[PDB]
Amino acid sequence: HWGYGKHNGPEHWHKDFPIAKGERQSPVDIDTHTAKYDPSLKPLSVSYDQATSLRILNNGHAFNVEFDDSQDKAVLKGGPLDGTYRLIQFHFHWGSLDGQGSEHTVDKKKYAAELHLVHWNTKYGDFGKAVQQPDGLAVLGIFLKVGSAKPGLQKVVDVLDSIKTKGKSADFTNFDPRGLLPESLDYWTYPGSLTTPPLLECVTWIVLKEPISVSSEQVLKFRKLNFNGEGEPEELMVDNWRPAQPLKNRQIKASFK
Ligand SMILES: [Zn+2]
């Protein structure tokens, strides 16, 4: 019964998920002056040309755009990563106001939203096995700021009315996630965790420096979603972000000078 309310929000999660107070929790604040350039990192390889989206689901905490992850069709490689990571889903975190919503922060700055493209390491066979490993997942995080619209987001925004409430899904084929990426792949990377329960410490985070712009109208549509199920009291799906956690014994590395 975790969520983002007063009585069940991030500050409560540790009671059911003690790993919430662990050594490599996410998100974190990215202190840009203390991140260090690492010349031995590579460029990221983001290979989404064969991506096969299937469905969009309101799971009660966010909406997930799900992919076919039964072959190496949309993969992330390179950067800090060893081996091949398959795209399974993406989702967002966002605020009630444009001044908050991101999970990671940059010099304490909060963005209006944050996109998470979730990938699992093929050496572990399935997502469920991958999340039990320290190098199981790679999550590409992309900040959203409010300004110009993102044309490649509009197909997502337009289906949201059909998945208003928890448990609703809709077919969502032929969506191209390349239309959600910024121009630059410059990034920061560090070892962390899922940002939702069970908070497993299985993620190599790759957070892009360049935000994407979305319009106020696009984010407004996110904010019409509901945390509740149909026929339950309406609670808008807003402020579905975990705040920054202690960095502890971690260094954030930069791919760029
Ligand atoms: Zn997320």
Swiss-Prot record:
Mutagenesis or variant effect for residue 194 to E/H/R: Strongly reduced CO(2) hydrase activity
Result of altering residue 103 to A/Q: Strongly reduced CO(2) hydrase activity
Cofactor(s) it depends on: Zn(2+); Co(2+)
Annotated SUPFAM superfamilies: Carbonic anhydrase
InterPro entries associated with the record: CA_dom, CA_dom_sf, Carbonic_anhydrase_a-class, Carbonic_anhydrase_a-class_CS
Outcome, altering residue 4 to F: Enhanced activity
GO BP terms in the entry: angiotensin-activated signaling pathway; carbon dioxide transport; morphogenesis of an epithelium; neuron cellular homeostasis; positive regulation of cellular pH reduction; positive regulation of dipeptide transmembrane transport; positive regulation of synaptic transmission, GABAergic; regulation of chloride transport
Binding site for substrate: 195-196
Annotated effect of mutating residue 195 to A/C/H/P: Strongly reduced activity
Effect in UniProt of substituting residue 139 to G: Weakly impaired activity
Active site: 61 (proton donor/acceptor)
Mutagenesis or variant effect for residue 59 to H: Reduced proton transfer
Listed result of changing residue 196 to S: Enhanced p-nitrophenyl acetate esterase activity, but normal CO(2) hydrase activity
Other remarks on this protein: Target of drugs used in treatments against glaucoma disorder and breast cancer.
Assembly behavior: Interacts with SLC4A4. Interaction with SLC4A7 regulates SLC4A7 transporter activity. Interacts with SLC26A6 isoform 4 (via C-terminus cytoplasmic domain).
Protein name: Carbonic anhydrase 2
Recorded name of the encoding gene: CA2
